[PDB]
Amino acid sequence: SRDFTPPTVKILQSSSDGGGHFPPTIQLLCLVSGYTPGTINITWLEDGQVMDVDLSTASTTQEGELASTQSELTLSQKHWLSDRTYTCQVTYQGHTFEDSTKKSA
């Protein structure tokens, strides 16, 4: 007997991948898969001012008998300048987690 599977979450940052022009932002995508046969929940704990359009979302994918869900985060660099606390809180049918970044300008 061994139902369910071992959940796994990761944190990937994509800030040093920008280029000339366009406004600076942050691309923090977490890597959560294996857990749940379909997927869990996608959430990010923000601490600073989630008033703008800075939100993080994850997609659902199939990994055989497991469930691979890719999480991403998008926030304006400006906000990052004002310092904040971003964390990709991934939930599960019976589990949870959180991994991201944080700064205090």
PDB file of C-alpha atoms in Angstrom:
ATOM      1  CA  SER A   1       0.000   0.000   0.000  1.00  0.00           C
ATOM      2  CA  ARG A   2       1.376   3.352  -1.095  1.00  0.00           C
ATOM      3  CA  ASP A   3      -1.102   5.896  -2.403  1.00  0.00           C
ATOM      4  CA  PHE A   4      -0.185   9.382  -3.556  1.00  0.00           C
ATOM      5  CA  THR A   5       3.370  10.400  -4.366  1.00  0.00           C
ATOM      6  CA  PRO A   6       6.254  12.466  -2.974  1.00  0.00           C
ATOM      7  CA  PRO A   7       5.641  16.166  -3.644  1.00  0.00           C
ATOM      8  CA  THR A   8       8.449  18.412  -4.824  1.00  0.00           C
ATOM      9  CA  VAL A   9       8.665  22.170  -5.219  1.00  0.00           C
ATOM     10  CA  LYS A  10      11.440  24.368  -6.556  1.00  0.00           C
ATOM     11  CA  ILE A  11      12.149  28.070  -6.911  1.00  0.00           C
ATOM     12  CA  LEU A  12      13.526  29.595 -10.088  1.00  0.00           C
ATOM     13  CA  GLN A  13      14.297  33.277 -10.507  1.00  0.00           C
ATOM     14  CA  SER A  14      14.442  35.070 -13.837  1.00  0.00           C
ATOM     15  CA  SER A  15      15.596  38.630 -13.276  1.00  0.00           C
ATOM     16  CA  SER A  16      19.037  38.621 -14.853  1.00  0.00           C
ATOM     17  CA  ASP A  17      17.559  37.697 -18.214  1.00  0.00           C
ATOM     18  CA  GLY A  18      16.237  41.084 -19.267  1.00  0.00           C
ATOM     19  CA  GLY A  19      17.476  43.339 -22.043  1.00  0.00           C
ATOM     20  CA  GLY A  20      17.572  46.910 -23.294  1.00  0.00           C
ATOM     21  CA  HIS A  21      14.256  48.712 -23.561  1.00  0.00           C
ATOM     22  CA  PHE A  22      11.100  47.488 -21.866  1.00  0.00           C
ATOM     23  CA  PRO A  23      10.471  47.931 -18.134  1.00  0.00           C
ATOM     24  CA  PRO A  24      12.412  45.779 -15.658  1.00  0.00           C
ATOM     25  CA  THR A  25      10.530  43.047 -13.836  1.00  0.00           C
ATOM     26  CA  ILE A  26      10.967  39.757 -12.019  1.00  0.00           C
ATOM     27  CA  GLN A  27      10.251  36.281 -13.334  1.00  0.00           C
ATOM     28  CA  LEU A  28      10.196  33.956 -10.348  1.00  0.00           C
ATOM     29  CA  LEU A  29       8.901  30.594 -11.507  1.00  0.00           C
ATOM     30  CA  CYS A  30       8.741  27.697  -9.074  1.00  0.00           C
ATOM     31  CA  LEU A  31       9.050  24.074 -10.123  1.00  0.00           C
ATOM     32  CA  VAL A  32       6.465  21.833  -8.505  1.00  0.00           C
ATOM     33  CA  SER A  33       5.663  18.435  -9.965  1.00  0.00           C
ATOM     34  CA  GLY A  34       5.352  14.756  -9.137  1.00  0.00           C
ATOM     35  CA  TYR A  35       2.841  15.519  -6.408  1.00  0.00           C
ATOM     36  CA  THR A  36      -0.817  14.774  -7.031  1.00  0.00           C
ATOM     37  CA  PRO A  37      -1.845  12.744 -10.088  1.00  0.00           C
ATOM     38  CA  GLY A  38      -3.224  15.923 -11.610  1.00  0.00           C
ATOM     39  CA  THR A  39      -1.873  18.831  -9.598  1.00  0.00           C
ATOM     40  CA  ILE A  40      -2.230  20.828  -6.403  1.00  0.00           C
ATOM     41  CA  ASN A  41      -2.889  24.495  -5.733  1.00  0.00           C
ATOM     42  CA  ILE A  42      -0.958  27.522  -6.927  1.00  0.00           C
ATOM     43  CA  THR A  43      -0.460  30.530  -4.682  1.00  0.00           C
ATOM     44  CA  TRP A  44       2.158  33.091  -3.731  1.00  0.00           C
ATOM     45  CA  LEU A  45       2.400  34.969  -0.453  1.00  0.00           C
ATOM     46  CA  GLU A  46       3.088  38.609  -1.227  1.00  0.00           C
ATOM     47  CA  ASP A  47       4.268  41.060   1.404  1.00  0.00           C
ATOM     48  CA  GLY A  48       4.664  44.657   0.294  1.00  0.00           C
ATOM     49  CA  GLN A  49       1.806  45.733  -1.944  1.00  0.00           C
ATOM     50  CA  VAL A  50       0.070  43.340  -4.305  1.00  0.00           C
ATOM     51  CA  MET A  51      -1.910  46.259  -5.675  1.00  0.00           C
ATOM     52  CA  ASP A  52      -0.177  46.399  -9.036  1.00  0.00           C
ATOM     53  CA  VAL A  53      -0.327  43.547 -11.522  1.00  0.00           C
ATOM     54  CA  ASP A  54       2.426  41.580  -9.827  1.00  0.00           C
ATOM     55  CA  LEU A  55       1.086  38.057  -9.481  1.00  0.00           C
ATOM     56  CA  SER A  56       2.460  34.543  -9.801  1.00  0.00           C
ATOM     57  CA  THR A  57       0.705  31.668 -11.529  1.00  0.00           C
ATOM     58  CA  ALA A  58       1.551  28.066 -12.323  1.00  0.00           C
ATOM     59  CA  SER A  59       0.487  25.712 -15.092  1.00  0.00           C
ATOM     60  CA  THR A  60      -0.568  22.080 -14.955  1.00  0.00           C
ATOM     61  CA  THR A  61       1.191  19.241 -16.732  1.00  0.00           C
ATOM     62  CA  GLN A  62       1.108  15.459 -16.894  1.00  0.00           C
ATOM     63  CA  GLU A  63       4.121  13.428 -15.837  1.00  0.00           C
ATOM     64  CA  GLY A  64       2.984   9.846 -16.298  1.00  0.00           C
ATOM     65  CA  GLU A  65       1.624   8.807 -12.921  1.00  0.00           C
ATOM     66  CA  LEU A  66       2.641  12.102 -11.366  1.00  0.00           C
ATOM     67  CA  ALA A  67       1.549  15.695 -11.849  1.00  0.00           C
ATOM     68  CA  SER A  68       3.954  18.397 -12.969  1.00  0.00           C
ATOM     69  CA  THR A  69       2.909  21.970 -12.292  1.00  0.00           C
ATOM     70  CA  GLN A  70       5.076  24.875 -13.384  1.00  0.00           C
ATOM     71  CA  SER A  71       4.794  28.022 -11.300  1.00  0.00           C
ATOM     72  CA  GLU A  72       5.759  31.478 -12.507  1.00  0.00           C
ATOM     73  CA  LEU A  73       5.947  34.932 -10.971  1.00  0.00           C
ATOM     74  CA  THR A  74       5.754  38.332 -12.623  1.00  0.00           C
ATOM     75  CA  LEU A  75       6.305  41.596 -10.791  1.00  0.00           C
ATOM     76  CA  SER A  76       7.497  45.034 -11.835  1.00  0.00           C
ATOM     77  CA  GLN A  77      11.114  45.730 -10.973  1.00  0.00           C
ATOM     78  CA  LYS A  78       9.939  49.051  -9.594  1.00  0.00           C
ATOM     79  CA  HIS A  79       8.103  47.259  -6.814  1.00  0.00           C
ATOM     80  CA  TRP A  80      11.204  45.164  -6.251  1.00  0.00           C
ATOM     81  CA  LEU A  81      13.014  48.458  -5.809  1.00  0.00           C
ATOM     82  CA  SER A  82      10.564  49.405  -3.082  1.00  0.00           C
ATOM     83  CA  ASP A  83      11.463  46.075  -1.526  1.00  0.00           C
ATOM     84  CA  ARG A  84       8.932  43.334  -0.892  1.00  0.00           C
ATOM     85  CA  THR A  85       8.403  39.703   0.042  1.00  0.00           C
ATOM     86  CA  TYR A  86       7.484  37.194  -2.639  1.00  0.00           C
ATOM     87  CA  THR A  87       6.926  33.514  -1.960  1.00  0.00           C
ATOM     88  CA  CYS A  88       5.453  30.838  -4.196  1.00  0.00           C
ATOM     89  CA  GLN A  89       3.188  28.963  -1.811  1.00  0.00           C
ATOM     90  CA  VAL A  90       2.278  25.689  -3.475  1.00  0.00           C
ATOM     91  CA  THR A  91      -0.559  23.771  -1.862  1.00  0.00           C
ATOM     92  CA  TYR A  92      -1.441  20.098  -2.078  1.00  0.00           C
ATOM     93  CA  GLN A  93      -4.406  17.792  -1.609  1.00  0.00           C
ATOM     94  CA  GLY A  94      -2.856  17.243   1.802  1.00  0.00           C
ATOM     95  CA  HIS A  95       0.329  19.284   1.832  1.00  0.00           C
ATOM     96  CA  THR A  96       1.729  22.764   1.322  1.00  0.00           C
ATOM     97  CA  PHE A  97       4.924  24.707   0.742  1.00  0.00           C
ATOM     98  CA  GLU A  98       6.415  28.107   0.003  1.00  0.00           C
ATOM     99  CA  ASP A  99       9.583  29.191  -1.763  1.00  0.00           C
ATOM    100  CA  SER A 100      10.517  32.510  -3.325  1.00  0.00           C
ATOM    101  CA  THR A 101      12.567  35.610  -2.607  1.00  0.00           C
ATOM    102  CA  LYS A 102      12.485  38.701  -0.429  1.00  0.00           C
ATOM    103  CA  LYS A 103      14.315  41.996  -0.079  1.00  0.00           C
ATOM    104  CA  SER A 104      14.191  45.184   1.957  1.00  0.00           C
ATOM    105  CA  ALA A 105      15.460  47.668  -0.603  1.00  0.00           C
TER     106      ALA A 105
END
